[PDB]
Each structure stands twice: as C-alpha cells, then as structure tokens.
Amino acid sequence: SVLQVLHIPDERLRKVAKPVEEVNAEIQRIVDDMFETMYAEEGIGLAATQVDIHQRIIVIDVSENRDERLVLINPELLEKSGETGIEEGCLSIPEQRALVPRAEKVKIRALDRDGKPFELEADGLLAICIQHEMDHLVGKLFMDYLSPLKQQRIRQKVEKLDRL
Template sequence: MSRLSILEYPHPQLRKLAEPVAAERIAEPAFQRRLDDMFETMYEAPGIGLAAPQIDVLDRFMIVDVTEAKDQPLVFINPQVRSRSEELRAHQEGCLSIPGVYADVIRADGIEVEALDRHGKPFAMRVDGLLATCIQHEIDHLDGRLFIDHLSPLKREMALKKLAKLRKRA
C-alpha cells in the first residue's frame, strides 16, 4: 500500500462533480488497491473520511471509519442519501483538504444512505450522529462541495483567513 496525496483548498478538482463508478470496475485489482491506499492515507492523516475527489480521482466513491479503534472501515460506491431526519445537529467539522480549520456545521442528525460496498454489493443503512455527519460531508465532496460552503459568509471568510495564516506559518 502507499500513501496518497490529498488535494488542498482551493484546488479546482475539489469543486468538480464526481462520476458514477461502473459496476465492472469495482472488482479490478487497481480499484481495490486504491481503496486500501485511501484507508492508509486517511488513517495516517489522521481523518475519519476521505472521498475520491480529494485524491484527484473524479469517481463517486468514498471511505469512512469514525471509530476510535479504526476497526470499522466502510466503503461507499455511488452513494445516495435516500432520506434525512428533520432533526438537525451541529458537529464541529474539519477536512483533510482544509487542514487545521474547524467549524460547526449543521446537518441532518440522521440519514438513510444506499450504496455499493467494496465488492459491488448494494446495501442501505440508517445512521445518526457522527457517522451521519461524516457520510454527508464526504458525499458533499462527491458533489463538489466543501464543509465551508455550509458556513455563513462571515464564518467562511474567518475560516479561510485561518487557513491562510496556517499556511504562512508552515
């Protein structure tokens, strides 16, 4: 396995719409290797989610593992949110593509998501809390959106100023 480069804001690829993954590609060794490389990259970063556009691949798939032990890796290929709870929740979000910047983002507290797993089998799951937030965050990446897009103009400006300051220090 190998660590992948993560694109950082304002890279233009982060704003592009990812294309669905053809079912026949899922079993290809290169695709499976890319999933393994993404998990290695995400865990080392460290992060709890990573979408293909963040590694400069405009395909509609993502990985997630919100556990402390990093022992429940989930793969979502061509994910779609089928329903969202009316109850909203604010979680402090960060992003591997906007390192060092965090902000409270309000999202649906619960969702039902459908996708294909890493073997191409369809599945659906109802989740809430941090896992629901993470899945919504990563699906945003597949749609060319970033967590800062959910912030007010003032908070977005403050977040981007913080990013610029962090980059100056580095």
C-alpha cells in the same frame, strides 16, 4: 500507497465526481490507498475527490479504536431526517473547525468494496460523516455553509499554514 490530499483553494476540490462504472482491482486499490491515506492523515472519513480522484468513492472509520472499515461506492441518500451539527473539520481545510447543519439520521444505499449493494441507516457521528463525504463528491465543502466573512477568514488561515 499514501496519496496527496488537496487543500483549499484548489479548484479540483470543486469537481463533481462520476459514478464508478465497475468495481474492479483498479477500484479496490484506490479504496485501499484511501484507507491508508485516511489513517495516515488521522481522519475518520475520505472522499476520492480529496485525492484528485473524481469518482463516487468514500471510505470511513468512525470507530474509537479505528478498526471499523466502511466503504461507500456510488452511495445514494435514500431518506434523511432531523437536524444536528458538531464542529466539523476537514483534511482539505487544515486546522479549521465549525458547526454546520446536518440531518440527524440518514439511510443510504451503496456498493461495498466487492461491488455488492447494501443499505445502511445511520445516525450520530456516522451520519454526519457520511454527509460530509457526499458533499465532497459534489464539490461542496463545510465552509460553504458559512458566512463570507467566516469563509474569508478560514481561507486566510489555511494559506498561511500551507505557506509554513
């Protein structure tokens, strides 16, 4: 199923997710719906928070042909380094994009869709995305890195869209 994606300024977006207690069928369905939703929404990543599910779950596909599925359950940032930034966009902040500072490289530990633990070292688009998603899990948005002026503006643009 395709789930509804919240938009700012829904305060549900500022909630802090809990850790998945056990990777089971219920969890795997959530994972499956999140992939469907992400591809439907044309995003390269999605955090459970965005669909009103407050558990540490993230799905990713940064692939060019959109055929590389990546699931991060209960992810942990192990090491990080460098600084970088692109013009990021968010499914929760429709049509707004901005450069935000990010580590250039990251190393994380997580559980896969089968609840199997794995380690991954990433860089380029993949690392920034991973960072974007993990921030969601702690109720943080990209616009938070910006100026109040810029923040107000983004907010206004979003409310007008959602109005139409």
